[PDB]
Amino acid sequence: RLWTKRRHAKQLKLEMANQYTDGVVIPTQDIIKVLETLITPGDKVVLEGNNQKQADFLSRSLAQTNPDILHDLHMIMPSVGRSEHLDLFEKGIARKLDFSFAGPQSLRISQLIEDGLLEIGAIHTYIELYSRLVVDLIPNVVLSAGFMADRQGNIYTGPSTEDSPALIEPAAFSDGIVIVQVNELVDDVSELPRVDIPASWVDYVVVADQPFYIEPLFTRDPKHIKPVHVLMAMMAIRGIYEKHNVQSLNHGIGFNTAAIELILPTYGESLGLKGKICRNWTLNPHPTLIPAIETGWVESVHCFGTELGMEKYVAARPDVFFTGRDGALRSNRMMCQLAGQYAVDLFIGATLQVDGMGHSSTVTKGRLAGFGGAPNMGHDPRGRRHDTPAWLDMRLQGANETETYLARGKKLVVQMVETFQEGGKPTFVDRLDAIDVAKTAGLPLAPIMIYGDDVTHLLTEEGIAYLYKASSQEERQAMIAAVAGVTSIGLTQDPKTTARLRREGLVVFPEDLGIRRTDATRELLAAKNIADLVTWSDGLYQPPAKFR
Amino acid sequence: LWTKRRHAKQLKLEMANQYTDGVVIPTQDIIKVLETLITPGDKVVLEGNNQKQADFLSRSLAQTNPDILHDLHMIMPSVGRSEHLDLFEKGIARKLDFSFAGPQSLRISQLIEDGLLEIGAIHTYIELYSRLVVDLIPNVVLSAGFMADRQGNIYTGPSTEDSPALIEPAAFSDGIVIVQVNELVDDVSELPRVDIPASWVDYVVVADQPFYIEPRDPKHIKPVHVLMAMMAIRGIYEKHNVQSLNHGIGFNTAAIELILPTYGESLGLKGKICRNWTLNPHPTLIPAIETGWVESVHCFGTELGMEKYVAARPDVFFTGRDGALRSNRMMCQLAGQYAVDLFIGATLQVDGMGHSSTVTKGRLAGFGGAPNMGHDPRGRRHDTPAWLDMRLQGANETETYLARGKKLVVQMVETFQEGGKPTFVDRLDAIDVAKTAGLPLAPIMIYGDDVTHLLTEEGIAYLYKASSQEERQAMIAAVAGVTSIGLTQDPKTTARLRREGLVVFPEDLGIRRTDATRELLAAKNIADLVTWSDGLYQPP
Helix, strand or coil: CCCCHHHHHHHHHHHHHHHHCECCEECHHHHHHHHHHHCCCCCEEEECECCCCECHHHHHHHCCCCCCCCCCEEEEEEEECCHHHHHHHHCCCEEEEEEEEECCCCCHHHHHHHCCCCEEEEECCHHHHHHHCCCCCCCCEEEEEEEEECCCCCEECHHHCCCHHHHHHHHHCCCCEEEEEEEEECCCHHHCCCCCECHHHCCEEEECCCCCECCCCCCCCHHHCCHHHHHHHHHHHHHHHHHHCCCEEEECCCHHHHHHHHHHHHHHHHCCCCCCCCCEEECCCCHHHHHHHHCCCCCEEECCCCCCCCHHHHHCCCCCECECCCCCECCCHHHHHHHHHHCCCEEEECCCEECCCCCEECCECCECCCCCCHHHHCCCCCCCCCCCHHHHHCCCCCCCHHHHHHCCCCCEEEEECCCECCCCCECECCCCHHHHHHHHHCCCCCCCCECHHHCCEEEECCEEECHHHCCCHHHHHHHHHHCCCCCHHHHCCCHHHHHHHHHCCCEECHHHHCCCHHHCCHHHCCCCCHHHHHHHCCCCCCCCCCCC | CCCHHHHHHHHHHHHHHHHCECCEECHHHHHHHHHHHCCCCCEEEECECCCCECHHHHHHHCCCCCCCCCCEEEEEEECCCHHHHHHHHCCCEEEEEEEECHHHHHHHHHHHHCCCCEEEEECCHHHHHHHCCCCCCCCEEEEEEEEEECCCCEECHHHCCCHHHHHHHHHCCCCEEEEEEEEEECCHHHCCCCCECHHHCCEEEECCCCCECCCCCHHHCCHHHHHHHHHHHHHHHHHHCCCEEEECCCHHHHHHHHHHHHHHHHCCCCCCCCCEEECCCCHHHHHHHHCCCCCEEECCCCCCCCHHHHHCCCCCECECCCCCECCCHHHHHHHHHHCCCEEEECCCEECCCCCEECCECCECCCCCCHHHHCCCCCCCCCCCHHHHHCCCCCCCHHHHHHCCCCCEEEEECCCECCCCCECECCCCHHHHHHHHHCCCCCCCCECHHHCCEEEECCEEECHHHCCCHHHHHHHHHHCCCCCHHHHCCCHHHHHHHHHCCCEECHHHHCCCHHHCCHHHCCCCCHHHHHHHCCCCCCCC
């Protein structure tokens, strides 16, 4: 009894809850009473809360429990998006929050902090948060979702496996309590397409009142891609991917990177680059990647999650994707994020604000955004030792042989951003909003998505600053200024300095890459709209209601 | 035209099935089955874990016909067994990507020189696992477990280690997964638990003998280890309020573990430092667990003789509902990078900039976990007190908010090795080894810019506070003894660094070298560890 306290405490709760269940199976109607039996005040409760898949029956039910029974819950959530997630704090059920992602436009978290109802632990990147689950955030309860369970608690999670294995294992092996909502219940393990979570990791399953919630978050409609996106995509391909021989990469989702994916088979083909760049991906199944897959550019994709409407296409492309012997995608957000850090040449994405040092954040005044995967994808991995050509291309040059052998490569981290945001606010600012948000919210650090010293390339509609080559912080600032347009930073640019930086190859304008702005048009896109993606997929892609 | 992998695999399963009972390969026919499932040029993952070896599969693979199996590309976390390198000598394998080398390091270099082994790269463990879904997608995985049922469900138990991270990439890309098991049972209910589900596994085989594992006797801890351990606890753990950590294995860190309950207790620090660990179940941690210092341990693997003690301490360790430890090397290394305050370890050589390696001339040693453990993780954003304590105050409030914390990375090394060779050198052996083996970088375990603390028997250099690269070098020289690096120190500079608190000798911390003896250890030998463990630890 000196060393079995966790085991004994869990056994008493299971014993009390079992009077309401049929073995592992909680009757759907009895979920609230069972939550009030299995959860204890002060518990660390992981709630999915995945970036895409939401255990929304469990989260809606948790928000209906009695706060005189369940209070001071410490929520651990990779992604905070559902309204009932924040209702937990308003209602006095939850008090503490550790998370990774939240929407950039919402004022709700900031307002709950100001009202004293929400206490932030810290904002994390995804796999950083998973890692704390075996150290100092060991979870007492995990609330997760899957497609199907048998009556032993074996779970099929399929294309939407996502975070679930990384969240469940820490609890399953520390006498935490694991509850999985499923869309369907079957009797025997042989009916499941496969077992993604073994029965011995699961304490209870419950059939959800309706299938688990999930939005199409990794689809960009080609019809909204503009010439400026195409121009920036051309410069990315010619001035970064080709220049450094990028074989493997992740794209942060947006119209800027969708244009890249959609002009590989046209502009990339015109440069003779098929099979020479962009072969291996860590990426969700972007519908905008379909033409690049169909024309043979894309050799492999490992996925953080699914994308709605892409499941049958993915199942019909098993040479490219990771699929089970049952046929369906197996995403794995922990494994994919790990590869995104250690195994790929390049990350490219966007941000809302960038200061004169290159520090980048999407937090703005009153809106405590979360990081998601961006910090893990957008840094130089200093534990990395294996060489690839792009990573070596970042290493110190001009040194003697000895010092060159002691220098190391760097991962490419590209900030690809227009000089002004949607709404007319400047991207480039003298001072990040994040600093004052840190003061207002009581955080010790400004919430920074990507630190300036981790950026190797700054790409705007004006050109590319090759920041990895800046010789001083003063030079770095002049190269940012050269591609910052008519923002406050851009208006400071010295024409003689900009000419010098272009002559030395530290800044490239479109003309320096052989690109005429009039060639950057929507006619370059392999697909102009969603219907075009369906055609490209041979009818396999089935657009969800958002894009129908 | 999009099912090529699926079709290729199916044809091989059909031929191999002529020799199997469903999933179960007969033990005597393993070689014929390997020659059927594996094809020349295949990328073959072979365990090969830091501890657990699928040595029946590796011995059998080394006995296959090189006219059938040649040009294999071996992907191996650890190259530990002699028959691993026999693969290259016999012309079965040609390319190698690996992380840890150990005693085969001398033979690795010899086979490179002979033209029989082509090195891809040396990796840290989780870096190698990450490539399995990008550019080293495996065609075959050869793994080991304790038990399988006749469906191919696997129990890996305390020795789970790398296996889930190795198997999943093949299981979901029409690779072929073969698992040797110590025992075969009929039904899944006869497994303690399922660690690897049957749909990830193509074949199992009962090994001819249990899978191979290899085993720090406290009797070999010296007074100088106790001295450095006292300085680590007083001058680093207490100073920075270290709550969570990893110890690189050695007598140096074993001394730390064993004087926490004595010296650390004398400092009043129980419960204030070293609560949460990413660590194997070191026998030398038993006293710190029994006396209440250790609140949690997550493990890369197990340790021999420690299974019954771990199962008897489920409040501390991660154990299944069946009762047994679940190690997870990928998960533990990830927490080692992102979730703990501190890493502390050693290397064989350190240069004047703090660059550190264990590669020496003619011995291509591996990295194992040390690069992943021994760097500042620049994707990390969450604060803890020790991580914040590394942040350099800015010129004002704004610049401090833009500054970031750092993970503590301690090099804990004696200035000379046993036998007389210096630890600190003007030039790492690793540079010429890179030239000899054809590597583009000197294989460096820990780069000097990642080091926050250099701890020697001469004291501690607080390198995280260094104002410049020149000051960093003077701080390294101050604690490098009479090595070539130490002889460069300017006495007026060393005196200033000590007065400013940037360098601390034992006297500056109030530690007398004559108090640093084996008498401070909580256990002096193996028998004491057994007693501390209430008889649960069973040494080999």
